């Protein structure tokens, strides 16, 4: 297990932090959050969606075909 | 502070500081506004030190 003070080397980097009792826990939750969700959805929709759309079409066709095959045809 | 009479310091004051403006501007008297304290943190990481 590693420990702080032995992780890596860093130089010339300043970090400004504010106390949690000094700031909001939900700053602009909807006024800023909803735009960010839409940005992230657009960036990944084309990678995630087409596979499951392909599943949905194969699912419905296979179920429709299985239903029709079980119904008899006139001789 | 030291070896000196308070009388002579006052004489030297009226002698060399009477020529000083004791009349402030009409509304340009500076007033110190209270300074907001902020619970916060600043970390200048510099491992070369």
UniProtKB/Swiss-Prot annotation, chain A:
Is Metal-binding there in the keyword field?
no
The family database entries (InterPro entries) matched by this protein are listed as: Cyt_bc1_su8, Cyt_bc1_su8_sf
Task: Write down the superkingdom of origin.
Answer: Eukaryota
Gene3D superfamilies, per database record: Cytochrome b-c1 complex subunit 8 (1.20.5.210)
The UniProt keyword set, sorted, is: Acetylation, Electron transport, Membrane, Mitochondrion, Mitochondrion inner membrane, Respiratory chain, Transmembrane, Transmembrane helix, Transport
Annotated membrane-spanning segments are: 39-67
Listed under subunit, the entry gives: Component of the ubiquinol-cytochrome c oxidoreductase (cytochrome b-c1 complex, complex III, CIII), a multisubunit enzyme composed of 11 subunits. The complex is composed of 3 respiratory subunits cytochrome b, cytochrome c1 and Rieske protein UQCRFS1, 2 core protein subunits UQCRC1/QCR1 and UQCRC2/QCR2, and 6 low-molecular weight protein subunits UQCRH/QCR6, UQCRB/QCR7, UQCRQ/QCR8, UQCR10/QCR9, UQCR11/QCR10 and subunit 9, the cleavage product of Rieske protein UQCRFS1.
The name of this protein is Cytochrome b-c1 complex subunit 8
| Species annotation | Bos taurus (Bovine)
Question: What gene name is listed for this protein?
Answer: UQCRQ
From Swiss-Prot, chain B:
Could you tell me which cysteines form disulfide bridges? none
Q: Where in the cell is it found?
A: Mitochondrion inner membrane
N6-acetyllysine carried by residues? 15
Known function: Component of the ubiquinol-cytochrome c oxidoreductase, a multisubunit transmembrane complex that is part of the mitochondrial electron transport chain which drives oxidative phosphorylation.
How does the record describe its quaternary structure?
Component of the ubiquinol-cytochrome c oxidoreductase (cytochrome b-c1 complex, complex III, CIII), a multisubunit enzyme composed of 11 subunits. The complex is composed of 3 respiratory subunits cytochrome b, cytochrome c1 and Rieske protein UQCRFS1, 2 core protein subunits UQCRC1/QCR1 and UQCRC2/QCR2, and 6 low-molecular weight protein subunits UQCRH/QCR6, UQCRB/QCR7, UQCRQ/QCR8, UQCR10/QCR9, UQCR11/QCR10 and subunit 9, the cleavage product of Rieske protein UQCRFS1.
Record's family? Belongs to the peptidase M16 family. UQCRC1/QCR1 subfamily.
What is the designated name of this protein?
Cytochrome b-c1 complex subunit 1, mitochondrial
Per the UniProt record, the source organism is Bos taurus
Q: Which gene encodes it?
A: UQCRC1
* Covered residues, full protein: 234 to 282 of 480
